[PDB]
Design a protein around this nucleic acid. Sequence first.
DNA 1: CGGAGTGTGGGC
DNA 2: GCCCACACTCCG
Lengths: 68, 68
Amino acid sequence: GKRMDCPALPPGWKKEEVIRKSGLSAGKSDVYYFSPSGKKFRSKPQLARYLGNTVDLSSFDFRTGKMM
Amino acid sequence: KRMDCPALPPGWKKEEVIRKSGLSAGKSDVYYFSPSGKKFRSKPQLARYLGNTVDLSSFDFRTGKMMP
DNA sequence: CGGAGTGTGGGC
DNA sequence: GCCCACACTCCG
């Protein structure tokens, strides 16, 4: 998967939470974000490198997609 | 390429093939060949083929060597 | 060679 | 002992 708009980010950005199905890490989740283009981001600093000074991410909680 | 892999049984060979282009340019895929010449691309496929007959607990697929 | 899915280890 | 951040596998 479900791609969910992320209101804390600019228009068309979506957040997805994928539960790991197998191996040693099973049941833990990974959070991905997608750009309006469709590009996949897997961490906060990756997200900041792409967005730069268009969005203040200092207080942005990558996991929940909420500003704090 | 094709080199003799000593930590597997008589006549197994390892092969490494450098990736030529793209985002993973310069990384390598490792392949194995049994005495028949059936190609193996991963440790689960290899383990499935060999079964109980060869102990791959400690087998590191990339280097081709058993590790403590 | 890509890339979803799982492994990995430093910083905490 | 956890988890961020990214490296790696493994099969398409």
